[PDB]
Amino acid sequence: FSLTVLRARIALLATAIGGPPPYKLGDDCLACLKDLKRWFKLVDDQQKRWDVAMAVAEYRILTDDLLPILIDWENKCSLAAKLANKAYYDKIALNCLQLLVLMTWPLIVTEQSSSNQITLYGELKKHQLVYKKTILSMESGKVLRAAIRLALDVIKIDRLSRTPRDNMVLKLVLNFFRNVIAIEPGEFTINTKKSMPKKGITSIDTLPPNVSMDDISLNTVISSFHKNKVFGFLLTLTSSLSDFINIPLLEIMFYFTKDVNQELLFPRTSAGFELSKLLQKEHQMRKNVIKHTSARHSRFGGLLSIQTPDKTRLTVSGSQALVDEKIALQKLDDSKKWNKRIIKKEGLPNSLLNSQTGKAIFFTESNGKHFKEFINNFIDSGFNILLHSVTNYFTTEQDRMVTLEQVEYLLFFAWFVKYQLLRSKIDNSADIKQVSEALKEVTFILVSSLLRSAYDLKNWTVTHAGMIAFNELLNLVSRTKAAQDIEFIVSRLFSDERIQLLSNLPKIGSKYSLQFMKSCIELTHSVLKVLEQYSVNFQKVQANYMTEPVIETYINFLERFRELEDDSIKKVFSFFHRVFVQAKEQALLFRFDLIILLREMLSPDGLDRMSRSRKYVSQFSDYFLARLKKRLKKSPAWFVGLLFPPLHNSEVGFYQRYGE
């Protein structure tokens, strides 16, 4: 009975505000706006119900009433700003935007959260997408042009002349930008209280019919940003950095770039050439597929017996097996219906924290061109200044930072410092000094301390937020060394204290997500190349790398060849290639896991024949087989020792791993 009364009040407020067909402000509009604000605030935190927002979304208040308020105020604001009760006509938009940011606030569910919040999270996440869907498509999304008025009114006055109260207005308006663009589809929380049936989840599309994946992607957000001029707003806000406009702004312009790769920026009928190439690749893989299918129908009945050792007469069907004995053996292998158990595992805005390499958001060519220059202009305007502004705050309240701050800060830092270096690599028009300002000693030691502290608390996500920056630390050290003593103080503290941390993560993180494993291989590849120009010892750092779990975690990445790219396979294979003659530690490489992956590599079903990956790999595997034959021919026990793991006995450790 309480819920339907709440619905009655929401409907009563809906018909009290007014409507169209020009929208009309009803009597006591401010009073009803304040009443709605008070009710929503009371039910949000004081009572923790999350039901008033639901009723508002139901009456389509945000679309039918709230948006037209700002749209109707926009023309009056333009007329007043071009002509040359303004306070009453200005304060009306304040409450509307305060309501908008409150409803657009992301919803977080944890164990401490009550059942109502988790129950309504799945029913309100779709409405969250609805809000951003209707906002972006509302006549070029001009509501953001009205939003920036709620900031330029306060920022216009002198910064030293700021207001102890009006200062919260800037935070409230700024939160709206980061809230609207952080809206992403949620997860279908399957009810796992009982065993699931012989069929899985039917539909994973968490989108209401009014919401389409076309109209909610970050491409739409970036197009709306460009068409609403707010690029100038974001540039001018950063141009006047010289506190409260730093923490929100850290993620206001980061959300749409939290997971967008920089490779799509440069291509390296224009879109149709890649279309033709992809058609060629899929034609090749389909051609490889049909090599197994019989020339005739399945019911042709091709039966055979393999005269296997012991004169066995095992019967396996299939005319395909009559072509090759290997096909018959594979049909023998996959005939078994028994399988083992494979164990498996975002609380913060989804991104690298949960995005596979192929999740490249489609961009319009014009939109891509605009976004290419927008971020470059931001870097040329205020990048290092913004970093130095938050350097002081980062040095304090180390234990007072919620896990959201690390994931929203470290990813931003690493992504932009990586983008600057790749942009400088592709084109020389950008100086390295534009990113060289991040080599400050205090910033480096603080970020390293955060990375090491995240290890002991089992905060794997926060630690993965740190490796992505640690890779670019070594990359930038190399870039500023080759293109050149400031780099020494940043790249000499990893002598004894930091070697354990970098040499332990690969041995333990192999039982987690793919990206966690991908971080460590890049770390090792970068660290093996930064020190090559000075060699504290080349033969000593590599000694701690040649360990069996390290080889296991490197070879576990190779099993995903159906999705590994040229560089992903290149780094993994080059790690073993660079130690073939420089280290000569191939004895630990003698597990069957690498041999079966080599068989998969050279097989046409794996790597592409026309590409430039399988040729050098095939030649190196040809040499690998020669090494295997030479080492196996000299030890009969090594024929079966190749399968079993190595031993801890003293004499055999040098007898087998080194051959006396």
């Binding site: 078994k336 024929f639 079993f644």
Partner: protein
Amino acid sequence: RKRRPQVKLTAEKLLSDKGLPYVLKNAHKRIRISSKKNSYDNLSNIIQFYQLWAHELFPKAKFKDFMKICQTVGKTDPVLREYRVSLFRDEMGM
């Protein structure tokens, strides 16, 4: 009352007649090697021996599961390491 338990890789089963003696005997007279041929054929021929040994020794489990279980047993059970040490000591005499 209770189902027949599934057969697992017991230590005794690892020393079957069609096991270690068979592979040790046929290593030097089963697989031919030639670098002129494509490496894929050589690798497939090499893995053929282990696959047939696993199937005729344990037709229940597949290839990858069998090798993973064997690796875990070798890393865990020290009797396999003791046997490997004994064979290494025997081979050291020559």
